[PDB]
Every structure is written in C-alpha cells, then in structure tokens.
Amino acid sequence: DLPPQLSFGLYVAAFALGFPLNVLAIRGATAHARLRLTPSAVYALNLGCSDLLLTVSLPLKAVEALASGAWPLPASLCPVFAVAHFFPLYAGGGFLAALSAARYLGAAFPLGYQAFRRPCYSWGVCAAIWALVLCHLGLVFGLEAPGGWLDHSNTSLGINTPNGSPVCLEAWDPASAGPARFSLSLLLFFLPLAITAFCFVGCLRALARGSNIFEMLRIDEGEGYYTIGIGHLLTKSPLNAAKSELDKAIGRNTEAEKLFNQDVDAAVRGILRNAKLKPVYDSLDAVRRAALINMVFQMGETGVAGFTNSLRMLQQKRWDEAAVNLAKSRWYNQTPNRAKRVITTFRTWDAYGLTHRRKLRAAWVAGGALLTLLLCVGPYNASNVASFLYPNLGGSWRKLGLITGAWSVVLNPLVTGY
Ligand SMILES: C[C@H](C(=O)O)[C@H](c1ccc2c(c1)O[C@@H](C1CCN([C@@H](C)c3cc(F)ccc3OC(F)(F)F)CC1)CC2)C1CC1
C-alpha cells in the first residue's frame, strides 16, 4: 500500500530539486572542461544530461501515480516515456563507475594517468554507455515487453489493458516481466557497482600510502648515471644486469615510495653517523628534520657538516638568522629554485604544496558515488531480484523502489558537485 498523495508528492519534490541542480551540474562540467578539458568532466556533463532526462519524465510518472498506475497520455508516447525514464535508472551506474574510475586512476597512479588520459577517450566510454543501455533496453523492449514481435496481441506498444484503463509497462505479465528485468539489473547494475566500490577502496588506500617528505622531494628533484625511482640508484655498470636489481627488490617484473622509504631509512643512519649533524637533527622539528634530509640527498653528509655556522644557528633555535646565513652560500648559488624552498621550510610545510587534497577529493567523489548507487538506484535494482525470485510480492515494493530510484536526480549531482 502506497497513497497517491505521497507518491505524487515524492515525484514532484524530486523534480523541483532534480531539474535545477542538474542544470548546475551540466553548466559546471561545461565551464571546467573549457578551462582545462578534464576527463571526468565528460562523465559529470554526460551524467547530468542523462539525469535531467529522468527529471523531466517525473511529472508524467507523478500523473501516472495520480491516475493510479493508469497511462494518461496517448499510447504512441509510452515507448518515449520508457526510454526517458528507465534509461537514466540504468545509465547513471555506467557514468559514476567511469567518473569514480577516473578519480581513482589519478589518486593511485597520478603520473601514468596524466600522460594517458585525454577528452576523446572519455567520450568513447560514454558513447559505449549510451549505446549499451539503449540496446539492452531496446532489445528487451522490442521483444519481451507487451506490444512487440513476440507478443501477438491487439494491445498497443508497451501498453497493457487489464476491466479498467490502459497501463504502460507496469502491468506486464509477472511470468515474463520478472526475467527480463532481472537480466537488466544483473548485467547493467552489479558490474558498474563493483568498479565504484573497488575505486572507493583504492582511493582510501591511496590516502594511507602517501608520505609528506616524498611529495617534498618529488617537487625538489623529480655522474648522471641512468637509474629508476625517486633517487634509488640502481647500479654503476650497464642494462639486463640493472633490470633484475629492480625486480628482486620489489618482486614485480620490469612503488617508488617503498624504494624511497628504504633509501631514506638508511639516509637517516648516515646523519647519525656524522657526529657534527646528529645533535642538530635530534633537537630539530619533525617538519625541519625533512628539510635537512633534502640537503643530505642533494649534497651529502660532507656538505651538510660544512655549513657549520648555519647548522649551529639551528641548534640554538634561531631560524631567521640561520636562513640569512644559508641565503649567502655556494649551495644557494649552485641550485637556485631548490635552495629557497628548503630555506623557507627550515624557517617555517607551507613552502611545499597539492596531493593530499586531490587524493582526498577523489576519495570523496567515489565515496559519494558508491552511496548514491546504494541509496537511489540500489533499492530499485534489488526489487528486480526479490520480485523475480519471490513472485508473491506486490507492486508496493517496486513503487517505492522506483521512488528511491527517482530520487537519484537530486542525489547524483550532489556527489559530483561536492
Ligand atoms: C578513466 C579512463 C578515462 O576516462 O580516460 C577510462 C576508464 C578506465 C577504467 C574504467 C572506466 C573508464 O569505466 C568503467 C566503466 C566502463 C563502462 N561500463 C558500462 C558500459 C557497463 C558495462 C557492463 F558490462 C554492464 C553495465 C555497464 O553500465 C552501463 F550502465 F553503462 F551500461 C561501466 C564501467 C570501468 C573502469 C579509459 C578510457 C577508457
């Protein structure tokens, strides 16, 4: 049991909210792809376009719920309501799976994806999304649905006539309506749901994997012997011999954090070894200790002990006087864009950006994308299972199911726009 006073009230309250925010969502992705041509902007704009398709179909579904299931527009427009309503209920999953995928790929693998990704590639995914759902629905509609080349009946296209008024699709024969709705859910929903979830997982795991000083030395650097990783020197002799030296160190054939961490873990043992630096490190900031390891990697324990006047000014807890003595040095003149970033960081992470926030925002797009699929689309998609397995259950479940599914239009743009 579901009263029409409530069903109409839910379908119009979701339309009054869905329509403008989607207009804000579309405008947002158009403005941000003009300024940069972002890969997930295509997903956000394409999600908005499909979302609004459902939004303008809500009044007709509100009037349908009013006329109590009965179809109130002519029979020649029901295959156009079906395509406008049920396409975004399945489509949304494919976009939020690629949108959340784009967010994860640039969270876990930022230097690889940035080089890989381009706009046209992302249009390719949506182009395959539009086609897939339009064909899966199209074929299931052109065959199984009442009024196709399978049902030899006088009843119009997608129209069922019970004594009463003609109803569009909802009055479908339970024996055939079940299996046709189950294949749509099984294929077009559980698989895009898995990627979104696995991406949200990966985004959480990209948060715990970062290291403040790595990002500080990634910006700083990036014999002249050919090697791999963030300064993790391979060998002095040339390449098949250098290859397995990297392969046996990680396990995988032919990540740089584990090799930087091990490199730094031993680099601290070198600072302790050099007695002229050891007291200074032990009295310094956790923040300022990383500004010293920056110079240690750059010059060595020789050059670090050489600047004795400035290091003593660091032991004496005087940052401003040491930074001036450091501003007039052979190192400052040698490396001009790196020196100053260490000097300002010694005196005061502010001087260094940029990765925490992007790994955090991307963990929140795929995080919200997971819950909009489990709170909007989800309950609906779960009824195409429960009604399929247990045929005794009434339309009261699916009516609320198609109601939560319709509240996708309000929830989905909030995910992308936060
Ligand atoms: C991030 C990359 C970029 O942007 O540049 C992009 C990429 C990489 C991985 C994934 C990327 C997209 O989309 C995810 C999608 C792909 C489209 N699938 C659809 C088409 C789908 C497949 C099914 F088997 C069943 C239902 C489906 O749902 C539907 F509703 F859309 F139909 C949803 C997952 C999976 C992971 C690369 C250019 C290719």
Ligand SMILES: Cc1cc(OCCCS(C)(=O)=O)cc(C)c1-c1cccc(COc2cc3c(cn2)[C@H]2[C@@H](C3)[C@@H]2C(=O)O)c1
């Ligand atoms: C196949 C077809 C034929 C057609 O016209 C045939 C020519 C008309 S005539 C014979 O009068 O000349 C018009 C359209 C829009 C379509 C068409 C194309 C793409 C998608 C669709 C919409 O399909 C669907 C499919 C399902 C639903 C809704 N719409 C309900 C079921 C399964 C899903 C669900 O409840 O989960 C329909």
